[PDB]
Amino acid sequence: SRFAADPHWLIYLPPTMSPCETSKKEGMLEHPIEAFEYFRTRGVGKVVCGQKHMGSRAVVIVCKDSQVAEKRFGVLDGTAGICYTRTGRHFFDDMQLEAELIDRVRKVLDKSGFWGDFNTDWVCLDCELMPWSAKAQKEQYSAVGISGRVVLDEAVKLLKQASLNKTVSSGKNADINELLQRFTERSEMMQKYVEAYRKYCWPVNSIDDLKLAPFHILATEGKVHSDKNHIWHMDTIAKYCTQDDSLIMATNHILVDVTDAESVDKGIKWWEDLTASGGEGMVVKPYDFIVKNGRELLQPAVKCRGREYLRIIYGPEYTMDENIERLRNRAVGKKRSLALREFSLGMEALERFVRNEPLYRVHECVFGVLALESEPVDPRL
Ligand X SMILES: Nc1ncnc2c1ncn2[C@@H]1O[C@H](COP(=O)(O)OP(=O)(O)O)[C@@H](O)[C@H]1O
Ligand Y SMILES: Nc1ncnc2c1ncn2[C@@H]1O[C@H](COP(=O)(O)OP(=O)(O)OP(=O)(O)O)[C@@H](O)[C@H]1O
- Phi, psi at residue 213, to the nearest 5°? -120, 90
The CA–CA distances, whole Å, from 211 to 55, 63, 114, 129 equal: 9, 20, 20, 6
> Please, what is the Cα angle at 122 between 120 and 125, to 5 degrees?
120
Q: Enumerate residues 6+ apart whose C-beta is below 8 A from 22.
A: 29, 30, 34, 320, 325, 328, 329, 332
Contact 257, 264 (CB under 8 A): yes
**Binding test (CB under 8 A) with a second copy, winner from 96, 142, 169, 319:** 142
Nearer to a second copy, 35 or 97 (CB): 97
For residue 89, the partner it binds in ligand X, a second copy, ligand Y, none, with Cβ less than 5 to 8 A by kind, is: a second copy
Least gap, CB of 28 to a second copy (angstroms): 18
Q: List the interface residues with ligand X, window 319-358 (CB under 6 A).
A: none
Beta strands 46-51; 253-257: pairing state: antiparallel
Task: Note whether 134 binds ligand X by CB under 6 A.
Answer: no
Which span (83-91, 252-260, 280-288, 291-299) binds a second copy, by CB under 8 A?
83-91
For residue 26, the partner it binds in a second copy, ligand X, ligand Y, none, with Cβ less than 5 to 8 A by kind, is: none
Least gap, CB of 109 to ligand X (angstroms): 20
Least gap, CB of 316 to a second copy (angstroms): 8
Least gap, CB of 282 to ligand Y (angstroms): 8
Q: List the interface residues with a second copy, window 294-323 (CB under 8 A).
A: 313-315, 317-318, 322
Task: Note whether 301 binds ligand Y by CB under 6 A.
Answer: yes
How far from chain centre, in Å, is Cα 107?
Answer: 26
Distance CA 192, CA 93 (A): 25
Where does this chain bind ligand Y (CB under 6 A)? 17, 50, 52-53, 56-57, 86, 128, 215, 251, 283, 301, 303
